[PDB]
Design a protein around this ligand. Structure first.
Ligand SMILES: *[C@@H]1O[C@H](CO)[C@@H](O[C@@H]2O[C@H](CO)[C@@H](O[C@@H]3O[C@H](CO[C@H]4O[C@H](CO)[C@@H](O)[C@H](O[C@H]5O[C@H](CO)[C@@H](O)[C@H](O)[C@@H]5O)[C@@H]4O)[C@@H](O)[C@H](O[C@H]4O[C@H](CO[C@H]5O[C@H](CO)[C@@H](O)[C@H](O)[C@@H]5O)[C@@H](O)[C@H](O)[C@@H]4O[C@H]4O[C@H](CO)[C@@H](O)[C@H](O)[C@@H]4O)[C@@H]3O)[C@H](O)[C@H]2NC(C)=O)[C@H](O)[C@H]1NC(C)=O
Ligand SMILES: *[C@@H]1O[C@H](CO)[C@@H](O[C@@H]2O[C@H](CO)[C@@H](O[C@@H]3O[C@H](CO)[C@@H](O)[C@H](O)[C@@H]3O)[C@H](O)[C@H]2NC(C)=O)[C@H](O)[C@H]1NC(C)=O
Ligand SMILES: *[C@@H]1O[C@H](CO)[C@@H](O[C@@H]2O[C@H](CO)[C@@H](O)[C@H](O)[C@H]2NC(C)=O)[C@H](O)[C@H]1NC(C)=O
Ligand SMILES: *[C@@H]1O[C@H](CO)[C@@H](O[C@@H]2O[C@H](CO)[C@@H](O)[C@H](O)[C@H]2NC(C)=O)[C@H](O)[C@H]1NC(C)=O
Ligand SMILES: *[C@@H]1O[C@H](CO)[C@@H](O)[C@H](O)[C@H]1NC(C)=O
Ligand SMILES: [K+]
Length: 251
């Protein structure tokens, strides 16, 4: 068995919340799992959630350079590829680089030290984008399994962010999927293999679109499009703003 094990395996259907825009300042949402930013949340916030019986997944970008992070200066010029979408503040990483991999180990150390129960590593799908580094599916598979073994070695769980094409090659090392918008793009069957194997899909839809963020609701039709799909009863769906601030609705 060329995989490592995690002690925390959340159940299919576990209710969750995700808030990545700012330091978490709303724990009123009755969700068992909170996915929050690794860097901008402190140990006391994470422990406070766990004291309330919740599990904390710590988000970070494993496949992109973000120019606002406190470790941004660790990255070398040779680690960086093309902009994610025309802004140099976020760039694709050479995920095969020893230096990139060591930075991600440093970030996993931080997650462990802060008490994170699991980690949610973003942008492991450079192969499906204009990355400028000839990234491949095999590169992501190697990288994701590297991240999973490193997280498990630090007693943390991990999951696959989108990247549906590589599911067969990493799923044994994953404790969940985080999916965005499979309902909008006719791909939820791809991700349904996770609950078929006892693992949740933490599922996000963005019905207000990519330019509107507010605390107001969506239509019943937009809610039904996000919520009702084959096997959706096994997906842990949240309806969110694209900016992933506090606001959330549940199915
Ligand atoms: C958890 O933490 C987060 C993060 O700290 C909290 O969210 C933050 O809350 C702050 C305080 O409410 C907000 O500050 C206000 O920002 C208003 C516009 O901000 C724009 O620019 C910022 C700058 O970067 C930007 O970040 C914003 O982007 C976000 O929103 C857009 C959508 O708009 C998203 O697309 C995006 O992704 C971001 O999420 C945004 O674009 C700014 O106008 C405010 O200054 C106003 O208002 C203050 C109070 O407003 C009150 O006015 C009436 C007066 O009668 C009052 O009755 C009412 O209750 C209002 O609350 C006031 O103090 C200021 O002096 C100023 O007033 C002047 O302007 C208004 C017109 O708007 C006039 O009426 C007035 O007479 C004056 O002329 C604030 O600076 C942060 O934006 C917000 N940050 C984010 C990321 O959301 C969150 O609340 C926390 N949650 C909990 C539960 O605690
Ligand atoms: C461990 O080693 C394997 C083999 O060397 C790596 O490749 C992956 O192996 C799995 C075997 O389970 C393949 O999985 C899938 O099998 C089922 C059939 O029931 C189905 O979903 C597909 O037919 C699919 O092939 C997977 O395709 C294969 N991937 C590649 C790129 O060869 C695997 O990546 C290594 N690591 C882990 C964590 O498994
Ligand atoms: C991304 O990083 C990897 C690892 O640093 C680079 O792959 C190496 O390339 C050199 C040739 O320049 C070979 O000698 C090594 O054997 C390669 N290592 C591996 C693991 O394949 C790769 O070239 C980098 N990609 C880009 C676009 O610079
Ligand atoms: C590693 O993670 C596991 C799982 O979260 C931790 O085990 C938990 O420990 C607490 C406190 O003793 C118990 O209340 C839970 O029932 C345990 N959960 C499971 C699934 O075993 C463990 O403490 C963490 N640390 C180490 C060093 O293993
Ligand atoms: C959800 O998963 C369980 C166990 O994997 C399965 O028996 C059940 O049929 C699934 N539900 C739906 C609606 O597909
Ligand atoms: K995204």
């Amino acid at each position: 068995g060329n995989y490592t094990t995690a002690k925390w395996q959340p159940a299919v259907g576990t209710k969750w919340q995700i808030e990545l825009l700012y330091a978490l300042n709303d724990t009123s949402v009755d969700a068992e799992i909170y996915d929050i930013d690794l860097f901008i949340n402190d140990k006391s916030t994470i422990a406070g959630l766990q004291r309330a019986g919740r599990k904390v997944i710590c988000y970070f970008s494993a496949g992109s350079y973000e120019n606002w992070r406190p470790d941004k200066d660790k990255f070398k010029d040779s680690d960086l590829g093309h902009d994610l979408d025309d802004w140099p503040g976020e760039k694709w990483l050479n995920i095969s680089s020893a230096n990139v991999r060591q930075i991600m180990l440093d970030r996993l150390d931080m997650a462990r030290d802060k008490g994170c129960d699991g980690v949610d590593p973003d942008n492991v799908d450079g192969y499906d984008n204009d990355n400028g580094l000839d990234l491949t599916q095999a590169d992501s598979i190697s990288f994701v399994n590297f991240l999973a073994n490193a997280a498990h070695a630090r007693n943390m769980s991990i999951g696959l962010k989108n990247a549906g094409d590589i599911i067969p090659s990493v799923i044994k090392n994953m404790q969940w999927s985080v999916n965005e918008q499979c309902a909008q793009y006719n791909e939820c069957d791809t991700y349904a293999v996770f609950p078929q194997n006892g693992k949740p899909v933490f599922h996000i839809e963005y019905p207000k679109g990519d330019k509107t963020n507010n605390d107001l609701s969506v239509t019943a039709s937009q809610k039904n499009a996000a919520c009702d799909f084959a096997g959706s009863a096994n997906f842990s769906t949240v309806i969110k703003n694209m900016n992933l601030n506090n606001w959330v609705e549940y199915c």
